């Protein structure tokens, strides 16, 4: 029963394997998201606490949160649910899924390390990985670099440089919600168009009012000659 542990702190994943069925009882009858003590699992695992994040059964079906069964059910899955991707808008498929309760019939158990123990795993704790891209929206740059509102954000976005022999350069994301004179001009244009339209409607209403009063005048003479 392979165990798919991952350590979010370092962005590290390692698939291990446990065979001795006497050494997996600590997970039996646990649910998804519940915490588990790593002390009883093997030896390299003293002090560890894991979060049960998921799993797949012997037939390959994934676990789903909220199905409190230790076996499989069939559900009408739609958009927004786990274990389903709609193929067209409004589609719903009835699919077989594995419950969120852990038994011996699982093939794999997915785990997240909540807190490191005392030893090190060769590739799950000692090493790290970086986040593949940096902030792209302006205010997330401010939040993450602790910048100020007034600081120039244009030149301090992180760049990644690809070295294809020669003529080498960095590639930087465009900043969305960055403020430019273009944005100000567009806002001014829209406000001015609202102003102009209101003006011209007021003028038209006034002119029609004078047309009404005019024909009132001529109608008064027309009726005053009878």
């Amino acid at each position: 029963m392979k165990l798919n542990i991952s350590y979010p702190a370092n962005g590290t994943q390692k698939s291990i394997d446990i065979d001795d069925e006497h050494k997996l009882r600590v997970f039996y009858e646990k649910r998804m998201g519940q915490e588990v003590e790593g002390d009883s699992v093997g030896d390299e695992f003293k002090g560890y606490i894991f979060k049960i994040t998921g799993g797949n059964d012997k037939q390959g079906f994934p676990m789903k949160q909220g199905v409190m069964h230790p076996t499989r059910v069939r559900l009408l899955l739609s958009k927004g649910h786990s274990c389903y991707r709609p193929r067209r808008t409004g589609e719903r498929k009835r699919k077989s899924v594995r419950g969120c309760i852990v038994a011996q019939d699982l093939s794999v158990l997915a785990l997240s390390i909540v807190k490191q123990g005392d030893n090190e795993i060769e590739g799950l704790t000692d090493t790290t990985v970086p986040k593949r891209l940096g902030p792209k929206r302006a205010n997330h740059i401010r939040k993450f670099f602790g910048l100020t509102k007034e600081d120039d954000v244009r030149d301090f976005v992180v760049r990644r440089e690809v070295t294809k022999g020669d003529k080498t350069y960095t590639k930087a994301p465009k900043i969305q919600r960055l403020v430019t004179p273009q944005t100000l001009q567009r806002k001014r244009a829209l406000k001015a168009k609202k102003v102009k339209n209101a003006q011209q409607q007021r003028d038209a209403a006034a002119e029609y009012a004078q047309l009404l009063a005019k024909r009132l005048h001529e109608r008064k003479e027309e009726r005053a000659e009878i």
């Binding site: 038209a204 209403a205 002119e207 029609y208 047309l211 009404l212 024909r215």
Partner: protein
């Protein structure tokens, strides 16, 4: 049938487009727009089958993608734009102008006009009523809406509209003695002058008309398009014929006479 049709079979296309039978299965389907599907002429027909400016519809697409072709002055790129009665089509690249007008034989003849002429049109008043905020408007036969019209205007009246600002220049009251032009029916394309109107409550009103040559012909009120104020003075140019019907023997005589 589950939803709106997007194809028009060739045999189901209106006959006044003179579409040849054996070209292919389908016909242009005029887009939703200012005029009815049946009583309009889509631009691809106008710019291909009339003027021969294009050998096919792909070249019609190319021509209109280059801002060449205009309807009522505005630029249109919808190949199937429902151009209809009184519409003005401008072609600046060729230095040429047109106006869709019913030739007496019953169709849309290729009516060339001048640049000064290609800046206005005419519009029948469908109805008059108050919108929101009590503002009065009148609806025309081309889906144009105009606010603050003359307080005297009622239904069945023709208005002059400038093609640039969308404003009304001048209009006509509907009464006996007006030059008109039949919009539908068997009397299509012919130009007459109002003689009398008979009012049927709940039914369809009837109008009695007379050509320049003395011919009294009746028509549904809904097919009457006022085109002037008196006899002999239209507010637009008229095609080669001035809207008077000639019998088949008359036309044959004229063809022999012209050709020698």
């Amino acid at each position: 049938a589950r939803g709106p049709k997007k194809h028009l079979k060739r045999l189901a296309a209106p006959s006044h487009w003179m579409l040849d039978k054996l070209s292919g299965t389908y016909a242009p389907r005029p887009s939703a727009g200012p005029h009815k599907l049946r009583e309009s002429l889509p631009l691809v027909v106008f710019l291909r089958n009339r003027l021969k400016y294009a050998l096919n519809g792909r070249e019609v697409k190319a021509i209109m993608m280059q801002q060449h072709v205009q309807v009522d002055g505005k630029v249109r790129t919808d190949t199937t734009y429902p151009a209809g009665f009184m519409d003005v089509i401008t072609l600046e690249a060729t230095n040429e102008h047109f106006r869709l007008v019913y030739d007496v034989k019953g169709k849309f003849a290729v009516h060339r006009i001048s640049a000064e002429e290609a800046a206005y049109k005419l519009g029948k008043v469908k109805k008059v009523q108050l919108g929101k905020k009590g503002v009065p408007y009148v609806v025309t036969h081309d889906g144009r809406t105009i606010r603050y019209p003359d307080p005297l205007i009622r239904a069945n009246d023709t208005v002059k509209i400038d093609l640039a600002t969308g404003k009304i220049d001048d209009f006509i009251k509907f009464d006996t003695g007006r030059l008109v032009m039949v919009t539908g029916g068997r009397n299509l394309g012919r130009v007459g002058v109002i003689v009398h109107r008979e009012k049927h409550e709940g039914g369809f009103d009837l109008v009695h008309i007379k050509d320049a040559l003395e011919n009294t012909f009746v028509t549904r009120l809904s097919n009457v398009f006022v085109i002037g104020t008196e006899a002999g003075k239209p507010w637009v140019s008229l095609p080669k014929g001035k809207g008077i019907k000639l019998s088949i023997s008359e036309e044959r005589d004229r063809r022999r006479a012209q050709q020698g």
